[PDB]
Amino acid sequence: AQRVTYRRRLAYNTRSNKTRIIKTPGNNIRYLHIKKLGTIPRCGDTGVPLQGIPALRPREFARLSHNQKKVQRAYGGCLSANAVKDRIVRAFLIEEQKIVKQKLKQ
Amino acid sequence: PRQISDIKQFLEIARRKDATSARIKKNTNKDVKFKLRCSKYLYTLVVADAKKAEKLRQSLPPDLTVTEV
Amino acid sequence: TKRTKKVGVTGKYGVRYGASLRRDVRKIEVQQHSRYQCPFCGRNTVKRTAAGIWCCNGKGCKKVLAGGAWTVTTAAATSARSTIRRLREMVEV
């Protein structure tokens, strides 16, 4: 059956030599050279992948509109929803404790 | 290539200045494709009716270049 | 079924290396692959990742603990902590 060749002079199965088979409108079986798969941004506090954002190679993110690269919320696109919620509650409670410790210091 | 699903949308793109030419393709299944060549994209509208195709062809701008395949 | 009377996990080594060596490895290997209890969360989801590093699973307490090579805590570390706590609590008062 039809056998294929690399379309570039790179002759080795490296991570930059990824391929997949296409069947053409000439009934030809041949390679298509494809890129590495994208990656979803990860939360800065927990490392979880961030929801609402596609998996792209780094420079592909330069072509999206602003709102596709973020979530409409504080730290959107940088922190997960549950991480932000921990930060808000932690900030409030710590500030209140600083208030009582200041009040009881006098 | 982009598909246009509305006749109103297709006519608006034709009235634009980048719209150079139009193509008429008559398929074996009696369906008609109106293809509009702009600078960046080729826009196809699929018209599944012969009566509608005639009206749409008459609905085009008069100075538009409509070419028959 | 039992499948082994003695060697246990060390059965992977077969007849090599000597019985005493396999027995010593056996005691340590049982320790280093055991599950331990997280003091901060209460679950038994504490497993080793590379020799002194013990991690936790779940959505809560994704923390990492510095521990012993083969167990989460060592006797020397536990004795040091109580020694340190006694010394801390005697200069405090």
Place this chain on the structure above:
Amino acid sequence: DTINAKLALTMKSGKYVLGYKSTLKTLRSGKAKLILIAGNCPPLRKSELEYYAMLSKANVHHYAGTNIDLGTACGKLFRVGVLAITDAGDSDIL
């Protein structure tokens, strides 16, 4: 007497909720008289639960024992990170 016996008494004849989400509901509603917090509770959660209690004027008892011991102390076979008591019934917890 120990708090375990009072906790055992208040569960034989009394009103209670177990767990974090249900506890917050009783604190919001004002029907929580006393909340018990496990010793190994998350430190941020303890601050939040303490703040909820202070606003609702409920008592907080941080009593020694992990969520495993607290679950056992209520007779349950699962870990309990926080209890809320809406009614002591026949017990002397309050």
Place this chain on the structure above:
Amino acid sequence: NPLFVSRPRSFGIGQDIQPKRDLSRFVKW
């Protein structure tokens, strides 16, 4: 007027970023 509120900075160890003091004595000349 009521919006002009004093916002003091402490500057003790580990509290606020130190203000820009004169470091001439410790300059590497």
Place this chain on the structure above:
Amino acid sequence: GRVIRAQRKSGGIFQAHTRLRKGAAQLRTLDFAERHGYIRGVVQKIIHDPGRGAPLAKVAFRNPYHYRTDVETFVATEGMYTGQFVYCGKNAALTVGNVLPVGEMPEGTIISNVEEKAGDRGALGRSSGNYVIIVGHDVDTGKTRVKLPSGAKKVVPSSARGVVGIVAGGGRIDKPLLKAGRAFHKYRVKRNCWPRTRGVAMNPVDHPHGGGNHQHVGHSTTVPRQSAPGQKVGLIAARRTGLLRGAA
């Protein structure tokens, strides 16, 4: 004869394999906050360091003079965890993980990563499971006496800093390696020092032990302290030899 193996360990193929190492493990530069008060840091990561038994801790501190955060690489003490607060300075509390001047800690405390000179950023008791014991203070001309893992007693200035607790990574050497391949993997991430050919397995051109119609040394293997390189092989300046039965 030719240049013996010990004489060739001067660089080149005998350098340390350091690609996979994230940073040296150091105390923190002794600054105003540590000299006079304390400063708080938070453990961000506890990580494996290739070629090192003990785990390392990445600790984030606020910069006192600039809007920026400084990450420090510490030798993790046992008990340390990510998200823990650690405190460094003269007024830090005596808790596992904190960094204090040895003069500020009582006799008998267990410490690790201790400085030899105040500000050298950690020299003593750093390998997995090791520690240093505070033995006594001499307040007049402040010098602290400590016991080292080797058993030696050392005098450090009572301003040299130390970390409270024992180095993490426990009793690593208690496990038999069991296989050449495991020793191979241990030294692959360290340096080109394994496997080792015995001197008596060589020819006279290669080693003072080489040659002979049986494998034997010939002369005594206890060689003088002042031997030249190339003859300083075997048991150097040995005070004694043989299987000791009761030592101190």
Place this chain on the structure above:
Amino acid sequence: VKILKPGKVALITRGRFAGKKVVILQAIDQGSKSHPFGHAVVAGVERYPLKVTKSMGAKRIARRSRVKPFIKVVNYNHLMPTRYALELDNLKGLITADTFKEPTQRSAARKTVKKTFEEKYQSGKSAWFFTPLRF
């Protein structure tokens, strides 16, 4: 003993206005058909006023001392209640479960909230309410 009641100041913990401070207007403890849970009607600050100093000009201070509010129905579980409370002069019965069904009534209610919040900001009787939480 009821933590959430009209006039109390709360912190939003989820959604687009996470970390924004709000004042409770209505406390619907029981669930309705729309929002079948213990929700509240709240008015909060979407954009806090900027700090103003004595060196500023008159026109600049007017620009910086502005509040852009929002009105929202929020699950109780997405609120962190505080100890502060507001006075709530004329924001009493103006935001019911009916102004949300009409965008016209929504903009009218927000404009009313904007006027009372802004006038309340000047001559600060609730300074903590108009200072952003840093997190």
Place this chain on the structure above:
RNA sequence: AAUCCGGUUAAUAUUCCGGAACCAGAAGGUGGAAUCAACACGGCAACGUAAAUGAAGUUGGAGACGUCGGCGGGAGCCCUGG
């Protein structure tokens, strides 16, 4: 960062030809959007949209990673009925 198919020569082709795309940079050529005093709305929320002002500084992410084992899907191939 970004290219595919079909065709073409005696002999080059993801490079030529036909057709159909894509990326990067520059200027700003129209259209649209927000702003009457300021920089949009929706959703309880996870989050959504055709756009939805954001300087310094800081922080976070991607780039970015071993090896073996079986399990589940897809594509091409293989096989099969008209």
